Amino acid sequence: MKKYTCTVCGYIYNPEDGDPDNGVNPGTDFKDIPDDWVCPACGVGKDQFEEVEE
Ligand SMILES: [Fe+2]
Numbered sequence: 603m604k605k606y607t608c609t610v611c612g613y614i615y616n617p618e619d620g621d622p623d624n625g626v627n628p629g630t631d632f633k634d635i636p637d638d639w640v641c642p643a644c645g646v647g648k649d650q651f652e653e654v655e656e
Contacts, residue, residue: 605654606632613643615651 603617615621615635620628621642626635632651640647 603629603631604656606651607654608641608644608646608650609652610646610650611641611644613641614654 606615615632617631618628620626620630624639624642626639635648637648
């Protein structure tokens, strides 16, 4: 799975770690994260994230 970054603050969503405190378990692909989730560091919506191509 690929990492995704918040294009507003730079936070990186890493699918191997998820965002468990906000209900996203490790191993969740960004696309499957419920669409009302927001960046844990600045609060903007998932629509401000972009795939990090490796
Ligand atoms: Fe952010």
